[PDB]
Amino acid sequence: ATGRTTEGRTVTVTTASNTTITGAAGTFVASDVGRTITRAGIPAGTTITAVASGTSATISAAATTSATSAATLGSLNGQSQGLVGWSPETDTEAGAYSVAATNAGTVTPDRLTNAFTPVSQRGR
Amino acid sequence: ATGRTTEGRTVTVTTASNTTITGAAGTFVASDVGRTITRAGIPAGTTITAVASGTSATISAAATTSATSAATLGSLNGQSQGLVGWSPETDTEAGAYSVAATNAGTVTPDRLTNAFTPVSQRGR
Amino acid sequence: RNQVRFPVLSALPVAYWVNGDTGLKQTTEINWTNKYLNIEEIATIVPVPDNVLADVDVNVWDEAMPYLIEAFGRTLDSAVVFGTNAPGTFPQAIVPAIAAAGNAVTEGS
Amino acid sequence: PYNNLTSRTDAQALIPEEVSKEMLGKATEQSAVLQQFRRIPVG
Amino acid sequence: AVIQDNTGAIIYNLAQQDMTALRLTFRVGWQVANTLNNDQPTEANRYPAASLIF
Amino acid sequence: AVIQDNTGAIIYNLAQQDMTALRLTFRVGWQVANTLNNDQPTEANRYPAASLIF
Known part of the structure; x- marks a missing residue:
């Protein structure tokens, strides 16, 4: 029910006084690269340059302080994601359909295994 | 999806060398009282006389040995429940509708708790 | 029925400048979701000692009815606009939602 | 025994699901430049 | 009919x-x-929608 | 057809x-x-043409 989106969001993040940011489990997501990040102790105009896991990410300039605090992540224009709004697939579920994932034998959403469970549909 | 039934079932159970039986989580449930029980180390015609938890119960006669084994629980004629077949409600959630439970504020198994979730059908 | 469903769209496609006259093309997809409308009740019960109904000045049921109907009306409105006592099955009340979207103006002029 | 009940959940699926199209669909803006500038064809 | 408090005490027996x-x-x-x-x-x-406030 | 990433990995085999x-x-x-x-x-x-800016 969480989905992918172009939207901004707010997060509690921990800084080391270097390139690198950490937070609670799943606070980052794979498409966050290129968003702006605006927090206390962070120099202006800084962006996410890479995400290593939902726990930690890298930024375009060194953080000036080491602390834990709330921070804000910008929206983006829907050029980098192939999309403009919100969609029910998570940023990991959207990867399930490729030839590589299929020859590797992973499961999509649905492809429903159990014989008796009836079908159901998502909401926001 | 498990519900209630009158038809019998098979279970794995541990005997103390007295009237006490124990087993894994969900091995016993409140409606089982008055069923027959047929296992090695158990004398003929023995029945469930009380049930104390999802893991423990009392029987009409002493077990002759202490061991763990598979055992059979008998079917029953549907006098001690109104139902003869199967129902989607389990024994605990079937209790929710009384005036006392309503005063205690216990949610029914189908009280739609969030504004954006669908209603959905159960299956076996 | 206890609930009813509305479908709605939730993303739109985009388009790209081609690099040169020969560069690689890029994908898009389009997607939908749904809202729900959930039903709830209102109810009351009024007791009276039935000897009063014989001794009393005039027919009290006939006198009371408009005020019962008004109460059913008002107890709806306050729960939707101001959010008084609203059941959790409803979407957020109007005044809080307007404040959350930033659509409030402060009369300073 | 006492405490029989044909509850809503026990009675489920003898009743249908309900759906309405009332708020689907969305209008569009027309493009500016194609509407405003002088058109010319080219080969 | 009868009427009860939340605890389940009978408050009124409407007939008796x-x-x-x-x-x-x-x-x-x-x-x-x-x-x-x-x-x-x-x-x-x-x-x-929008609102005027004080 | 096939759909490719910029590295030349196939993402979808549209036919199969x-x-x-x-x-x-x-x-x-x-x-x-x-x-x-x-x-x-x-x-x-x-x-x-002319513009208003701020």
């Missing part, structure tokens, strides 16, 4: 006490249709 | 996987046609 009572009921719900538009794609920042 | 796809294209360009006029012969200082 020579009383009478009237019962009323109603059913409703509402929804808002704030769909996506191009004008403001940030859904947290759309609302189809 | 029972899929369908739609391609759309369009070709355009634009020009101003600012022209010699007596009131401002210095071409760098002509433009047939």
Whole structure:
């Protein structure tokens, strides 16, 4: 029910006084690269340059302080994601359909295994 | 999806060398009282006389040995429940509708708790 | 029925400048979701000692009815606009939602 | 025994699901430049 | 009929006490249709209404 | 067809996987046609439009 989106969001993040940011489990997501990040102790105009896991990410300039605090992540224009709004697939579920994932034998959403469970549909 | 039934079932159970039986989580449930029980180390015609938890119960006669084994629980004629077949409600959630439970504020198994979730059908 | 469903769209496609006259093309997809409308009740019960109904000045049921109907009306409105006592099955009340979207103006002029 | 009940959940699926199209669909803006500038064809 | 408090004590036996009572009921719900538009794609920042406050 | 990433890995085999796809294209360009006029012969200082900015 969480989905992918172009939207901004707010997060509690921990800084080391270097390139690198950490937070609670799943606070980052794979498409966050290129968003702006605006927090206390962070120099202006800084962006996410890479995400290593939902726990930690890298930024375009060194953080000036080491602390834990709330921070804000910008929206983006829907050029980098192939999309403009919100969609029910998570940023990991959207990867399930490729030839590589299929020859590797992973499961999509649905492809429903159990014989008796009836079908159901998502909401926001 | 498990519900209630009158038809019998098979279970794995541990005997103390007295009237006490124990087993894994969900091995016993409140409606089982008055069923027959047929296992090695158990004398003929023995029945469930009380049930104390999802893991423990009392029987009409002493077990002759202490061991763990598979055992059979008998079917029953549907006098001690109104139902003869199967129902989607389990024994605990079937209790929710009384005036006392309503005063205690216990949610029914189908009280739609969030504004954006669908209603959905159960299956076996 | 206890609930009813509305479908709605939730993303739109985009388009790209081609690099040169020969560069690689890029994908898009389009997607939908749904809202729900959930039903709830209102109810009351009024007791009276039935000897009063014989001794009393005039027919009290006939006198009371408009005020019962008004109460059913008002107890709806306050729960939707101001959010008084609203059941959790409803979407957020109007005044809080307007404040959350930033659509409030402060009369300073 | 006492405490029989044909509850809503026990009675489920003898009743249908309900759906309405009332708020689907969305209008569009027309493009500016194609509407405003002088058109010319080219080969 | 009878009437009970929340604890389950009988407050009135409506028949034995020579009383009478009237019962009323109603059913409703509402929804808002704030769909996506191009004008403001940030859904947290759309609302189809505004207010004057003090 | 097949759909590729920029590295040349195949993402979808449109034929084998029972899929369908739609391609759309369009070709355009634009020009101003600012022209010699007596009131401002210095071409760098002509433009047939103006703006309000802040």
